[PDB]
Amino acid sequence: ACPAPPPGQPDIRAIGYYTDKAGSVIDPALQQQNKDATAPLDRYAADVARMSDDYLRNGDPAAAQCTLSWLGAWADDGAMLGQMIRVNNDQSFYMRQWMLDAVAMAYLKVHDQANPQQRARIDPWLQKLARANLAYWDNPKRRRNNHYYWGGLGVLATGLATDDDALWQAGHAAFQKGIDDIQDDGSLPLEMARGQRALHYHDYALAPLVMMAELARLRGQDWYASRNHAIDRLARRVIEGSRDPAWFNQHTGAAQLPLQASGWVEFYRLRSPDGGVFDAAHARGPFHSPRLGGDLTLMATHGIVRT
């Protein structure tokens, strides 16, 4: 009933696909090469997300056990613990952040079913991935843009799932850095440099921030409140941008690619009475994002965890 897991590869090879300084104009040939190079990793991310979604849907212990079996197998293989292979950028380092976010969120959703021996194989594997991801940010030259926030999500989730306070603190640090980047106009300077994809990259930066706030909520802490609800300024900047890109068009000088808001709207619409602001975006779901933890529609309604 539980299909055999695919083999875990120690190395990641991934390829950058922007042609311009502002990381906004895509080279189709490099994009497809990146897709083909990362297809095993994205298939595994999608599979553990879906199987962990099915556990939350009906409580089926088979779904949880299959998720834990796939996680255990990649742990045993030292998956993603080898070389981060560079072709034209650090796209491999980014894949290890996104993959940690998927696998650590999948593990958190099924953790309540995990026996002491599954915990002993999976916990140390997630913890080394988290430290590898933190170590990347030790170089002051790498600017702490949306990648930093996507990085914090996986480190925080590992922290929570494996009871590692050092990883929780480093996760919180990343959240707080992102909240403090939010300007009075609700913009993020490092995302404003991204041209026709500026609006896209505000949506992309907000998502891991929302999901770190949801993880805090599991421990009974309200991080939405930080800096008198500063996160609301970014949520407004994004949701109004999806309705009308004019403000972004004026501040970037580039015509924006039209944005449909990602599934952070599913959690956000429930944290305050929204007076209809997220009605249109909600109607575009359900939202499946393995790197945010899978079925955000399901998790916003029923909880990231069952207990």
* Most distant pair of Cα atoms in the chain: their distance: 56
Experimental technique for the deposited model: X-ray
Regarding the domain delimited by 12-302, which CATH topology (the fold level of the hierarchy) does it fall under? Glycosyltransferase (1.50.10)
Residue type at 289 in one-letter notation:
S
Residue 74: CB atoms within 10 Å: 23
Q: b/e per residue, 113-127, with b = 16+ CB within 10 A?
A: bbeeebbebbbebbb
Instruction: Please name every residue paired with 294 in a beta bridge, in sequence order, or none if there are none.
Output: 289
Sequence ranges of the domains in the chain: 12-302
| 80 contact partners, CB below 8 Å, separation of at least 6 | 8, 9, 10, 12, 41, 74, 96, 99, 100, 129
Resolution, rounded to a tenth of an Å?
2.3
* Six token digits for residue 207: 């998502």
* Residue in 43, 53, 48 with CA at minimum distance from that of residue 69: 48
Write the DSSP symbol of residue 255. P
Handedness of CA 145, 92, 285, 22 (dihedral sign): positive
Question: Are the beta carbons of 248 and 259 closer than 8 angstroms?
Answer: no
